[PDB]
Structures are given as structure tokens and as C-alpha cells.
Write a protein that binds this ligand. Structure first.
Ligand code: SF4
Length: 753
């Protein structure tokens, strides 16, 4: 049949739409119903389509991903696990992207130069580990993992896994793209099936079309606000309706990206002519013509069943701005000034930030450059400090060329490197003292406490790039671009017109500089060397096998109250220096969670010494004194970033299990990967029966079975004991992960010795 390749860097690796169509037909004959598109791509990729038991919300799917993509903050450890597996070459297409370790201070050239001095040990390690296991290396300066995947590797019907929670961006080009932790990526690179819990499916029906100030961003600001951060847990959001053609391929990618802030497994859009056009503009018109031929299998069946259906009329949608401490608190731009005032949100905006992978496209930058030029033409500049982060070299080279970059500098913006930077908090922020109370509006996705500048008093809002620009000219939340009047140099009160710009370059894309390095697959005789005195990289030492015993009299390290996001468990910013080193990064364990006893961060009672201390130190105390421990947590524990570190570091410091009312998807899978026991209250009111002082015995591990709950005895100080039941989502593939001590230890017992 056709021999069309996956990318311009893997020409011998062919797109298998012929497989997709065979597995779809087998599955559809067993189910006898319409399949949604996500169902066609996910079941179309099953390892065993004829025997795979399929229940939405219940079964685990043995799947076969087409490719793996890692960024450098989650990549080092993924490769440290791959090294430990013993295997010689990765088994599917795989890439590493250096975007995460590049700190914004001075602006792109210098910053990029500095970060290459500063992170030389890591980048070198990644490029050598790549050269060796046959993994593609995109160099520091290339771009952000999600912009490079959409411009180069995402296509209709790909199943892609990425070690990042914002991998769902790829659903803008019609594939199923799921964020995972470095251990799920090791399965796939090692050739062992990847298991996913069969998604439920939220249908969003889009109607009418966008105009003027309204953009893509607003559509998911609106959905985020309607579903709340836990509304899409265990579900894919499938967009459909006549309104989908009205949105560019770029914007469909924005909507899918931020579907991660409502915890969705991923998001997907149906292949359509705005994607055809994008594939052709980015050198892939052959994939586009091959996808016209399989179009049927790349769009939903007639009459397919959504578990939930939300209708969004695009034509009535208003600009929004979400926040400031969660992405699901939505306001129409029109009302946020009035609300800010009412709440003590600092109305004056200190920094406007535009870019990141959620919103640094050619169309996003043109829409921003078109608000910027109207200010300039009346002699203005930003009241607010203004930074621009292009999502790729290709976008920095083309907007530069088509003259957008210039306009953004003339209004006073600084063009940062094509790197995450301020989005992840790699930002040497100096315009505020720590704990100063300020506002910043971003075109980003996540705005949770102190994410961008580590200052917990920063009120960070997320809106769209053209809104960030218009409000950065105002320097106030008190400015609605639709109604209000600016004042030029000329003494004249003007209004700002709605931006219209080209979705794609008139000419084609200017690729920029040399940033890729393909694996020499001739040599591969690189020694990937880890200096044993390195503070950045350390080889993993395997975890203990399970002792065959019940986990008796466990100590509660912390009983967490409210929101305990991954970044509370393992913080980023300055800690990203240690993502290759398990011991020095363990020093950030749970320092950001609030303790229910005293309601502080990083202050828990040591049980022995009765002094209140830091959580890492206290867990290291219990480990050094043989005290096995547990974390009691509330709802949607582990929400956020996909980083497996939130699960390696508790296991490192003697953690045994984490009991919560609910878990976020990725985090729960990482805790199981690492031999820890993720569990949930059979009744969430039981959380109230546990106080910090009690000891807990998890009873029944010997006949740990799927669907069978576990017994937990609460041993109170006073000889009283309650038994509660704890549910778990294990299956027997995962119970062997527990028994072996971790997934990787299990994999190495399967390796014959
Ligand atoms: S830190 Fe921000 S710019 Fe980087 S991949 Fe995540 S969402 Fe995108």
C-alpha cells in the first residue's frame, strides 16, 4: 500500500493507516455501535483487538504507541530508567527536546548562551544517551516539545506519548496524544505494551464561529470554567459540531493543550480541511493526501455516544481571563476589573507574558503584533513589562522575517529564547521583592500558586496573546479592549480594533537554524557516562522487593488538607537542576503541602522528637530510624505536571502508601510504577476519622486482588481502633509492580535473570 513516512527525520518509518483500519474493523464488529473518533484511534491501536475486553471507565487497554517524545526535565530520569533496563536501542520513534532548563533573565541570545554553559553536563548526557539508544536530539534553542511535535511529528491518527502533561496539544492535528511519566515511556521504548484505563468520552459541540476579539483560548477558558479542574478526569474531550471548521489548526492545538487543566486523559479534534492546509504548509502534504484517503477512520462515526455533551456557541462567546490561582475560575474580560477590585487582586499589571506552547503560533503572534501596531501608531509602549517566547526556531525565524517580532520589540517587549522559561518558573524575576503583591497576565495554561516566579502573592491570570498585549498597553485589569478608550501621545482618545492576521505564512516557513541531531546508527558506541560525584546526574539504585508482609503500624508523615498538586509534592523552578539526581531532588518532598494540624507548609511534627520540622528531613528521620510512612491526602491528589519525581522521592524517603479521597490520573500511575500503594477511602468521610497521631495497618496485602478493597486499621493512641476499607484501581499487571518493588524491577525479573 502507500509508503508515506512518519516524518522528515524518520523516512523509512511508515504511517500505518492500514493497521488502524484493520483493528478498527475487528473492534467495531465486536461492539456493534458507532465509535467516537478517540475510540477509533485508541481501539485502532490495541495490541490485541480481537481479545481486548473494552469497557469505558473499567478496563485497561494494552496499546501500541507510534512514538515517544520527552522534554529535558522529565527525560533524564526516563533515560536513567532505560539504562537500568539493559536494552540497547529504543523500539518506536523517540525524541528528546531541550526546552525546560533555560532560564529567562536577559533575552534569548544571552539566556540561551548562559543556559548552555550552565547545563552542559545534562545536554551532553542527553545527546550522548540519544546517540546511543537511537533517540532524536533537538538541541537547546530548537523549541518547546509541543510546538516541535505539531510542526513536525503529529499527524491524523498518530497515538503519541509524551513525558509532559501538555502532550494533548497534538490533538489539534487529530492524533491521540497522552502525557505519561518516564516509566510509561520506558515501556514503549522497550517494546512492552502500554496500558491505559479505557477513557470515558466528553463530547464538546462547537457551533457558530469566532469573531473579533474571541479566539481559541477563550473556548477552553470557557470549557475549563464549566467543567472545573476535575470534570474531565479519566475522559478524552472530543470536539465536534459545524463550528470546528471555523478554528485554525493552531487554535485547535490551543484548546487541546489546556484540556490538561481539567485533567482530561487527552483532547482530540476530527481531521478536517484546516489540518490539511496546516500539514501542507509545514512540508507534509503527502500525509495530508494519505489522510484524505483514510478520512473515514479519521473522523467520528455517525451517531456515536458521548458520555457527556456540552454545547458551545462560538458566536456568542466573549473574551475571558481566568484566575488568579486556578485555571477554572473564569471571568469575561469585561467583568474582571470590577471583580479584581472587589477581591484585592492588584489591578495594575506588572508583566504581560506571551508565548509558551499554548499560544506561540504564527497566527497568535500576528494577532498580538496587530494590537501592538495600533498602540505604536498613537505613540505608545507598554505600561507593563512585556516578554515574548516563540514556541520554535521556525516560529522565531518566520515572525522575525514577516516583521511581527519587530513590532513587539517597538512596543517594548523582550523576545525570550524558544524555551518554557517563565511558564515553568525558569525566570530570574527581579521587578518585585519576594512576597510583594502583584499581577501578571499570561497566554499560558497553569496559574496555580507561585508557579511562574515562586512568589505566592503573584496574581497570575491566563488569557489569549492579543488580550495580554492590549492589557499590557493599559497596565490595568481595569481595561476592556472591546469598549474602552486609550489616550495617544496626540492627546487622543482612541479605541482598539479587533485583530485580523494570517493564520499561516503567506510564503512558507522559515526553518531557522540547525537544532536537530539524528542518532548515528552506525556508531552508537557512545559511553553514556555519569560522573559518580555529580550533583546533577545519578544512576538509580533499585528499590526493595515487597517483604511479603502487611504494612504494620505506619506513621502518618503528613495529612494534607485541600489542593495537593504535584508541584506541592515536588516543586519545579530551582529544583529542575536536580531532575537527574534522586537524592538532592528528594529535598523538596512535600514542602509545599499544607498540613491539616497547624495549617502550614513545610512544618510537620516529628513523632519521636516532638519538634515541628521540614517534611524532607522528617521523612529522612523516619527512614534512618526504620519508621515506614504514609501520606493522607484529600481530593485530586497529584493534579498537574506529569513528573514521576512526585512518586520516586516518597519511595526514596521510606514512603509506603498514599491514601486520598481521589487521585489525578498520571500521578496515580506513577505511584504504582514505583512500588508505592495509591489508595482511596471507600467512604471519603473516613478521612475525618484519621488524625495525625494515629498509626495505620494496611491489612490483606497477601491476597491483593483487582476489585478487592483493602482493610485499614486506624490504631488510635488510646487503644481504640477503627477498620476502614480502602479501594484501589490495580489490575494484576500492576500488582506484580508492587510485589517486585517497582515496574522496572518486574521488567528485569522478566529479562531471564
Ligand atoms: S512549561 Fe509551559 S511552555 Fe513548557 S511545555 Fe509545559 S505548558 Fe508548554
Amino acid at each position: 500500500r502507500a509508503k508515506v513516512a512518519m516524518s522528515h527525520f524518520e523516512p523509512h518509518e511508515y504511517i500505518r493507516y492500514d493497521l488502524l483500519e484493520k483493528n478498527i474493523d475487528i473492534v467495531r464488529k465486536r461492539l456493534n455501535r458507532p465509535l467516537t473518533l478517540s475510540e477509533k484511534i485508541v481501539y485502532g491501536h490495541l495490541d490485541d483487538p480481537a481479545n481486548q475486553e473494552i469497557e469505558r471507565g473499567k478496563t485497561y487497554l494494552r496499546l501500541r504507541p507510534d512514538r515517544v517524545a520527552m522534554q529535558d526535565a522529565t527525560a533524564q530520569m526516563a533515560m536513567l530508567q532505560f539504562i537500568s533496563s539493559g536494552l540497547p536501542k529504543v523500539a518506536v520513534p523517540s525524541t528528546i527536546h531541550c526546552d525546560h532548563l533555560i532560564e529567562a533573565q536577559l533575552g534569548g541570545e544571552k539566556d540561551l548562551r548562559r543556559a548552555k554553559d550552565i547545563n552542559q553536563e545534562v545536554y551532553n548526557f542527553l545527546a550522548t544517551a540519544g546517540a546511543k539508544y537511537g533517540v532524536g536530539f533537538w538541541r537547546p534553542g530548537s523549541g518547546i516539545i509541543h510546538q516541535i511535535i505539531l510542526e513536525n511529528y503529529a499527524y491524523p491518527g498518530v497515538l503519541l506519548i509524551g513525558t509532559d502533561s501538555h502532550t494533548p496539544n497534538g490533538g489539534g492535528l487529530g492524533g491521540i496524544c497522552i502525557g505519561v511519566g518516564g516509566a510509561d515511556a520506558v515501556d514503549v521504548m522497550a517494546g512492552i505494551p502500554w496500558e491505559l484505563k479505557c477513557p470515558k468520552v466528553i463530547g464538546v459541540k462547537l457551533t457558530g464561529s469566532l469573531s473579533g476579539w474571541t479566539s481559541p483560548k477563550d473556548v477552553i477558558l470557557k470549557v475549563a470554567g464549566i467543567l472545573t479542574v476535575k470534570g474531565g478526569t479519566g475522559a478524552i474531550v472530543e470536539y465536534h459540531g459545524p463550528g470546528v471548521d471555523s478554528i485554525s489548526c493552531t487554535g485547535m492545538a490551543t484548546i487541546c493543550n489546556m484540556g490538561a487543566e481539567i485533567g482530561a486523559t487527552t483532547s482530540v479534534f476530527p481531521y478536517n480541511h484546516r489540518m490539511k492546509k496546516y500539514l501542507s504548509k509545514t512540508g507534509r502534504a503527502d500525509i495530508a493526501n494519505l489522510a484524505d484517503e483514510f478520512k473515514d477512520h479519521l473522523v467520528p462515526d455517525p451517531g456515536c455516544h458521548y458520555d457527556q455533551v456540552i454545547e458551545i456557541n462560538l458566536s456568542e462567546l466573549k473574551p475571558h481571563i481566568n484566575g488568579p490561582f486556578t485555571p477554572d475560575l473564569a471571568h469575561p474580560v469585561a467583568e474582571v476589573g470590577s471583580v479584581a477590585e472587589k477581591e484585592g487582586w492588584p489591578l495594575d499589571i506588572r508583566v504581560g507574558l506571551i508565548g509558551s506552547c499554548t499560544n506561540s503560533s504564527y497566527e497568535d503572534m500576528g494577532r498580538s503584533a496587530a494590537v501592538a501596531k495600533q498602540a505604536l501608531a498613537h505613540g505608545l509602549k507598554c505600561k507593563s513589562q512585556f516578554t515574548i517566547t516563540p514556541g520554535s526556531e521556525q516560529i522565531r525565524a518566520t515572525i522575525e522575517r514577516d516583521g511581527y517580532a519587530q513590532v513587539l520589540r517597538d512596543v517594548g517587549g523582550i523576545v525570550l529564547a524558544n524555551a518554557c522559561g517563565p511558564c515553568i518558573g525558569q525566570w530570574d524575576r527581579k521587578d518585585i521583592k519576594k512576597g510583594e503583591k502583584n499581577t501578571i497576565v499570561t497566554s499560558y495554561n497553569r496559574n496555580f500558586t507561585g508557579r511562574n516566579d515562586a512568589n505566592p502573592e503573584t496574581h497570575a491570570f491566563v488569557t489569549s496573546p492579543e488580550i495580554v498585549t492590549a492589557l499590557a498597553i493599559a497596565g490595568t485589569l481595569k481595561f476592556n479592549p472591546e469598549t474602552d478608550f486609550l489616550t495617544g501621545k496626540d492627546g487622543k482618545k482612541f479605541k482598539l480594533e479587533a485583530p485580523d492576521a494570517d493564520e499561516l505564512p503567506r510564503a512558507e516557513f522559515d526553518p531557522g537554524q540547525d537544532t536537530y541531531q539524528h542518532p548515528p546508527k552506525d556508531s552508537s558506541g557512545q559511553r553514556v557516562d555519569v560522573s559518580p560525584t555529580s550533583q546533577r546526574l545519578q544512576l538509580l539504585e533499585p528499590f526493595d522487593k515487597w517483604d511479603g508482609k502487611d504494612l504494620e503500624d505506619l506513621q502518618i508523615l503528613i495529612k494534607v488538607k485541600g489542593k495537593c498538586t504535584t508541584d506541592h509534592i515536588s516543586a519545579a523552578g530551582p529544583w529542575l537542576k536536580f531532575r537527574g539526581h534522586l537524592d538532592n531532588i528528594s529535598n523538596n518532598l512535600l514542602i509545599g503541602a499544607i498540613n491539616i494540624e497547624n495549617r502550614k507548609a513545610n512544618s510537620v511534627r516529628n513523632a519521636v522528637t516532638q519538634e515541628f520540622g521540614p517534611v524532607p528531613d522528617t521523612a529522612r528521620y523516619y527512614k534512618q530510624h526504620g519508621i515506614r510512612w504514609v501520606v493522607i491526602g484529600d481530593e485530586n491528589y497529584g493534579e498537574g505536571s506529569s513528573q514521576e519525581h512526585s512518586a520516586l522521592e516518597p519511595r526514596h524517603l521510606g514512603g509506603r502508601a498514599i491514601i486520598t479521597k481521589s487521585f489525578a490520573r498520571i500521578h496515580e500511575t506513577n505511584l504504582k510504577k514505583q512500588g508505592l500503594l495509591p489508595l482511596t477511602f471507600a467512604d471519603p468521610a473516613d478521612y475525618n476519622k484519621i488524625h495525625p497521631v494515629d498509626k495505620l495497618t494496611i491489612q490483606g496485602l497477601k491476597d491483593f486482588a483487582p476489585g478487592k478493597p483493602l482493610k485499614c486499621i486506624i490504631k488510635h493512641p488510646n487503644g481504640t481502633q477503627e477498620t476502614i476499607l480502602l479501594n484501589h484501581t490495580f489490575n494484576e499487571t500492576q500488582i506484580e509492580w508492587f510485589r517486585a518493588g517497582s515496574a522496572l524491577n518486574r521488567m528485569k525479573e522478566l529479562q531471564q535473570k
